[PDB]
Nucleic acid binder design. Structure first.
Ligand SMILES: [K+]
Ligand SMILES: [K+]
Ligand SMILES: [K+]
Ligand SMILES: [Mg+2]
Ligand SMILES: [Mg+2]
Length: 136
RNA sequence: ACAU
DNA sequence: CGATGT
């Protein structure tokens, strides 16, 4: 329908999938970058999209903000709703860091509360989410 | 199929 | 063209 401009938008960026994963959150209205995660050497697109939403939840909660979060990831929105990131990525020494962060994000969700609406960014209608990395 |  | 996901 209408974009809710008073919101936080998040997105993953990667070099390969699986590959190097990062994410960022921006003010939907202004494009101001509000947070950026240091690149993680191996992860998946969906793991990064999940981490980005959870980081957004933590960021808004710390600031007493009731703004919604936009994500373009059907998968990550569902994983956050379920409090469970159902990634297929093998757990081995190479993937230990991303899996540690995902495990810690799930743990945060299981021990905290939030009312933040997590909304699907409608890329087909509105173009690329404002947190997009411009790499595609 | 749809969403990345 | 390849991959991650419901
Ligand atoms: K997109
Ligand atoms: K991109
Ligand atoms: K597929
Ligand atoms: Mg995305
Ligand atoms: Mg993007």
């Amino acid at each position: 329908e209408e974009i809710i401009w008073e919101s936080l938008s998040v997105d993953v960026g990667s070099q390969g999938n699986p590959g190097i994963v990062e994410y960022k959150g921006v003010d939907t209205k202004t494009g101001e970058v509000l947070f950026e995660r240091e690149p993680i050497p191996i992860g998946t697109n969906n793991m990064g999209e999940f981490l980005a939403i959870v980081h957004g939840l933590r960021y808004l909660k710390e600031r007493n903000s009731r703004k919604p979060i936009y994500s373009d990831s059907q998968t990550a929105i569902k994983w956050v709703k379920d409090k469970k990131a159902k990634s297929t990525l093998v757990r081995n020494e190479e993937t230990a860091l991303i899996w540690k962060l995902v495990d810690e994000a799930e743990e945060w969700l299981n021990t905290h509360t939030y009312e933040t609406p997590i909304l699907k960014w409608q890329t087909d209608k509105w173009g690329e989410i404002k947190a997009d990395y411009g790499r595609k």
